[PDB]
């Protein structure tokens, strides 16, 4: 367990915490490329929603993601619905590798 | 009125019309190539045993091998009343530019997709070559089309197996970032503006990264009466006809070389235009391509129409139900084998209290002891020992496994033989020969044979470019199907052997043997033998 240590000492009773952001400032972000990660999944075909909807793949340009282009029609009112669903999740798997640069943090 | 709106209207109509067949074909492709458990894009599914006990794939392998053992290629034969050697040059050109690996690979891909899904296709393209050209510093090569069912979309109002009456066809290209840069470099597009089109693929397997960049190519055929020019060939030639659109820059160089115009007619012909399109804009508008037909050749399995609706089928569609039932039954039986308590005795704790170590499974004792007396009930009640029943596969499971396997075996019988599939490949090859002949007439340099030698009449413009001069006597040979040969020498050798097989042992047999020796390859000994054969053939006049 000691091989995973990252700090020199533990929190010893009444220790003073310092807030490192004291003024509002637009952030600059530096990271290692494998720290922020995006997991994308297609909508399941037989979901509770998208019940009577015909679905096809829909590739989103720019970002390398796909989504579900679902479509349904109504016969009572001669209308229809479209739904472009994009199911994705952002994860910060190495927060100790992600950083933040705050300029002008004067007291 | 908008060109993009018209193109997209046509494409949308075709996509909607050909929807169900495409879904079925894609399902058969994925079923027969990746996995029979088409149950990934689904929720409420826990982790259970799912095995794939295939019984259809060996049949597909057998059919593919049987179709592969019997190659089929075009064979150009002279028409009725034409010169007997009217097709030798065209046949040589076809063999020369179709002997390469890409043609065979594309044909094999189309055949495999026909057997599995029901429809395949390939394409014919023209490229500039400077090292080993076939003719006019250009070559024609055959390229593959993967997943033709979802990637090639034909005109909805086409009622032919080879789609020769279709007036337009769209091919969807899907690629990653490097592929999009490649395409942009090749076709002089803007690589910065990422294109988009209808996605032909579908997310059905946990693939790490699917393709995102889509674009489309639209081929259209326009049949019209254009103007032709009737000249007088300087080399004792009858009135020779050319197309004004073709000979437009050498219009004065013809007269300079010695061509005098005699008259001007109007001859109907077809012309093919390609447009590179996305879902938002048209990049290339009407780039004219060579030939008279759409350069895409389709190959079909069981093909027909039901109610103005195209249907095609291979060998996998019908066996799917039985295969899925057999897989399910085997999975259930594996669950029965695994998660079922074994056959062990049922004991009251007081029956074996004290003698626990005798029943664990060791073999240090000659018998098992049981407690007899109870301090409250006097004596322990007597009951015959019971054991947990052994696991058993139910009669329903067994009989359904057998019945499903029998049904799959019964229904996965193409023919009694792949005769019809070889006939659809042959029809595709006939259409390929038609398209190739048209493209050759459009771009290649075909000599004309005179009975007075092959006279090549060509001229160069002021920009040093050479414009081919092809007379309208271009359809002198028709298309047939024969064995695939790498070269005209191989074809001649096969013909000589076939004649020898039926000629009796006489003077024609001697002639045919000497001809076979004449048409042999060259080392040293066969060189000596062929020289002897040539000497004998010359000496007998």
From Swiss-Prot, chain A:
The keyword Membrane does not apply. Keywords: Capsid protein, Late protein, T=7 icosahedral capsid protein, Virion. It comes from the Viruses. It is found in: Virion. One of its GO terms (molecular function) is identical protein binding. The keyword Nucleus does not apply. GO terms for cellular component: T=7 icosahedral viral capsid; viral capsid; viral procapsid. GO terms for biological process: viral procapsid maturation. The insertion domain (I domain) plays an important role in the folding of the capsid protein by acting as an intramolecular chaperone. Self-assembles to form an icosahedral capsid with a T=7 symmetry. Interacts (via N-terminus) with the capsid assembly scaffolding protein (via C-terminus); capsid proteins and scaffolding proteins form building blocks that assemble to form the procapsid. Interacts with the portal protein. Belongs to the P22 phage major capsid protein family. This is Major capsid protein. It comes from Salmonella phage P22.
UniProtKB/Swiss-Prot annotation, chain B:
The keyword Secreted does not apply. GO terms for cellular component: viral portal complex. It is found in: Virion. Changing residue 299 to A/T/M/Y: Overpackaging. GO terms for biological process: symbiont genome ejection through host cell envelope, short tail mechanism; viral DNA genome packaging; viral DNA genome packaging, headful; virion assembly. Keywords: Capsid protein, Late protein, Viral capsid assembly, Viral genome ejection through host cell envelope, Viral genome packaging, Viral penetration into host cytoplasm, Viral release from host cell, Viral short tail ejection system, Virion, Virus entry into host cell. Changing residue 60 to A/T/M: Overpackaging. Forms the portal vertex of the capsid. This portal plays critical roles in head assembly, genome packaging, neck/tail attachment, and genome ejection. Procapsid assembly may initiate with a nucleation complex composed of portal and scaffolding proteins. The portal protein multimerizes as a single ring-shaped homododecamer arranged around a central channel. Switches upon genome packaging from an asymmetrical conformation in the procapsid (PC-portal) to a symmetrical ring in the mature capsid (MV-portal). This change of conformation may serve as a signal for headful packaging. Homododecamer. Interacts with the terminase large subunit; this interaction allows the packaging of viral DNA. Interacts (via C-terminus) with the head-to-tail adapter protein gp4; this interaction participates in the head completion. Interacts with the scaffolding protein; this interaction initiates procapsid assembly, thereby ensuring incorporation of only one portal ring per capsid. Interacts with the capsid protein. Belongs to the p22likevirus portal protein family. This is Portal protein. The lineage of its organism: Viruses, Duplodnaviria, Heunggongvirae, Uroviricota, Caudoviricetes. The chain holds residues 5 to 580 of 725 of the full protein.
